Design a binder for these strands. Structure first.
Lengths: 85, 113, 200
RNA sequence: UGGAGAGUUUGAUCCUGGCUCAGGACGAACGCUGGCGGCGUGCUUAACACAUGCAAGUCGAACGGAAAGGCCCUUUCGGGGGUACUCGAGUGGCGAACGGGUGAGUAACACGUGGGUGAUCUGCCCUGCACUUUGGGAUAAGCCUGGGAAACUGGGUCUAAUACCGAAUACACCCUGCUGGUCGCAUGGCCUGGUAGGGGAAAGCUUUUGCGGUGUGGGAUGGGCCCGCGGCCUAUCAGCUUGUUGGUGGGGUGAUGGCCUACCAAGGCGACGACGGGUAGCCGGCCUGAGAGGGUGACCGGCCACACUGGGACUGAGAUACGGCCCAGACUCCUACGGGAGGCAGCAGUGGGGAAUAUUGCACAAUGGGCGCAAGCCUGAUGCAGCGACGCCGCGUGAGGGAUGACGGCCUUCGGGUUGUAAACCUCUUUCAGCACAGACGAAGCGCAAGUGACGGUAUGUGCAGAAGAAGGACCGGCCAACUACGUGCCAGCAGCCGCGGUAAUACGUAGGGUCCGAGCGUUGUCCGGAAUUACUGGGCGUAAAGAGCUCGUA
């Protein structure tokens, strides 16, 4: 509020927040769809939904939106959930 | 980045430094990982001692000397040894020792007789 | 600071002569003032205090400096009494006085404080300067011709120079072989009384 | 290396036992007094409220550009074009989480010490290996225009990137299935084990000592989490707990874990003091002490916590985000009443509180830090200076000679004694101050420019003149060094205790004298010692305080 760098950082932090929010919302939607598909009980749609969701997860990990460990945990959980079914 | 800095000691008029290895984020007089020499600029030849092997180790792991420490490392030849450009030549101008008090005592006694 | 008042007062009060050759003390060897003749009550504290006053008014050392000296002497690994005596004797002004270059300790202190001397090639004007082994005390060339040093250099028949000191040059150089031991000190009073007083 | 006692209960004694005193210390304050220097140190109270000025920027070698200097073409002197040397504003990167302040909260894994992590993260830095392919859509700025008092903000058009986005490759990495060997400390770990499937990136700039981008192996640094042990007072606080104790499946996290959640079981803690109440930042250290111990946490150094009060997340490698954001509240300010702005416990400074604590100073010359290839820029960090006997240390205020011992004072036995070698005088020396001249180190530094020290013309050195400009405070009945006179009279007063004042006071007041200290000397406050007076070292209980009324018996 008092220092030029702070005002510039206000704007830039806002734009970064918008981007991160979009990425996280997309990831959450993909996970939700996959979970619903597994709940339905069909394997093939769950199969390539898992593939697409894993790709989205580690691609978001590359962007820095989520930590690579978080992507690994989510991928492992989804794969184990599919394997159990 | 771990750096090889100079911390300040001594009293107000006479700064005497220690060549310390410390993180760049710590304060000047903060905790030090290691002490690898000392540097007293107040003397006429400005005594410099650097423990060569520890300096070599810390340069090997990637510590970054500050400008005064870089100048000192060049003077003692440690920097050149680490790089290897002209060789490892000691340019250190050691302080010239002062004759013993006993020498002067006997000299005065003989001068009397 | 310094003590500048009459010197004979302290000698009369302490019952001994501290200057060494003063006639007034011999004329009246009793304490000063109106009641210098009254009999005194005897107390160990009084004797110890008077011994300390003798020591610190012979050498012209104030109480705080004397206490520092006593702490230093006690800390040393010898014995306290002679350690204190040797520390007192190692003062520059005392060295100048015992070297036969000053009639009295006061004038030795005055000469030292005025920077008429020079120890180890560097000018020193500090009466409390302590002198170590193989120390060479010299008079600077400018003041060699002054009347004080003149009459000091032509009356070298007074009090003998102790063993630990030795004047070697016709210009009255001083050499210090080692710090004096209790045997060669040759001082009045009793060190044990001072040690007892400062342990109270 | 190393422990000292004295007074006070009685007519007198011994003992027990309390009180008091002699010592040391201080972030001190007050009284009287006060010359200098060196080195330190200075809001302990209101985490009270804050005027003003500074305390975090930087990069044109990421980018479009051209507001201000430079240069060059042009001219009517109004200016106009180019340049990219350069650079305001802007996009972008890195920094801003360090450094600096404070001690409110916190009795807690906060701190100290030692471990564990087969349960974990780590930007910049160092060092191996592999890469750095390909395409696209915007937008700030600019221009035009609207709203509002202002703060600020809407629309249209337009433009660039190392800004943003899609794909390929990676098979070193991530996930899953099967499978081999091996080490264990059980989950498990390791052999970059093998094998099948799926998948995960990058950015260019610059001609000059050239700087950069991405993945991955290993270092280095900085962390996170868990645990043993250790350091307050209070049962006139005995019960406490329901995500609370454990399991399973999920979720969540960098990571383990009731961290969260559904279900299940009924546990878990507590007289070895749970649960409450009070107080408190912790430590290296500091003071005291013979030591054990006691008190303490100022400076300096480490860790924690907080940033008007209370919640919350965002960005980021990293956030109690002091000089960031959002909300609520209190307070202060502006308003065209529609709405807005602010946060000194940063450096100085102001008001208030108080017994009491400083300059709205100088410099980036040195060290440390941020950005930059670099030159360089920023840095109230820091280096210095100013103020305060606030502390420690050192020095001076003169030295030698000088008498049947001058004058004056005071006492007197009227003789004389004391001030007193003190003084007067005769010489000597000038320390420190004063004046004059010269004048540093701190910089084997920085700079490819010619120079560069804030301190500072200081310290210091050499000359000049002259004892010339330089001493006060407390105390003097005993403890406890040091006594007389006059004044006063159970008054005025003193006093740490014992106790002193009743016309002849060594105890009040004042003068002579004396003693102890000395630029200080005393008083008050606080802690330790003396105190073996909480006794571990090192005490006691028949009559001095002290054996439960007596047994049985739980831990």
């Amino acid at each position: 509020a008092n220092i030029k760098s702070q005002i510039k950082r206000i704007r830039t932090n806002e734009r970064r927040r918008l981007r991160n929010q979009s990425v996280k919302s997309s990831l959450r939607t993909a996970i939700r769809g996959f979970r619903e598909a597994v709940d339905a009980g069909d394997k093939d749609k769950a199969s390539e939904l898992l593939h697409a969701t894993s790709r989205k997860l580690d691609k978001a990990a590359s962007k820095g939106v989520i930590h690579p460990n978080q992507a690994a945990n989510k991928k492992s959980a989804l794969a184990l959930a599919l394997n159990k079914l | 980045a771990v750096k090889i800095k100079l911390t300040r000691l001594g009293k107000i008029r006479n700064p005497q430094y220690r060549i310390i290895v410390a993180d760049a984020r710590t304060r000047r007089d903060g905790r030090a990982i290691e002490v690898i020499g000392r540097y007293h600029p107040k003397e006429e030849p400005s005594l410099i001692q650097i423990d060569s092997e520890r300096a070599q180790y810390w340069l090997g792991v990637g510590a970054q000397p500050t400008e005064p420490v870089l100048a000192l490392l060049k003077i003692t030849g440690d920097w050149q040894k680490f790089k290897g450009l002209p060789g490892a030549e000691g340019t250190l101008k050691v302080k010239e020792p002062k004759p013993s008090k006993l020498d002067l005592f006997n000299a005065a006694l003989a001068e009397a007789e | 600071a310094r003590y500048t008042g009459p010197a004979t007062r302290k000698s009369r009060r302490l019952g001994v002569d501290l200057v060494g050759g003063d006639q007034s003390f011999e004329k009246r060897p009793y304490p000063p003032g109106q009641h210098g003749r009254a009999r005194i009550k005897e107390s160990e504290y009084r004797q110890q205090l008077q011994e300390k006053q003798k020591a610190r008014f012979s050498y012209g050392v104030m109480e705080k400096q004397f206490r520092r000296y006593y702490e230093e002497a006690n800390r040393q690994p010898g014995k306290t009494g002679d350690n204190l005596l040797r520390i007192l004797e190692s003062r520059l002004d005392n060295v100048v006085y015992r070297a036969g270059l000053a009639r009295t300790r006061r004038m030795a202190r005055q000469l030292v404080s005025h920077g008429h001397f020079l120890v180890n090639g560097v000018k020193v004007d500090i009466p409390s300067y302590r002198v170590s082994q193989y120390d060479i005390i010299d008079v600077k060339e400018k003041s060699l011709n002054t009347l004080p040093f003149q009459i000091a250099r032509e009356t070298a028949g007074e009090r003998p120079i102790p063993s630990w000191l030795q004047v070697v040059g016709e210009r009255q150089r001083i050499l210090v072989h080692q710090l004096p031991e209790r045997a060669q000190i040759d001082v009045p009073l009793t060190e044990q009384l001072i040690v007892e007083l400062y342990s109270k």
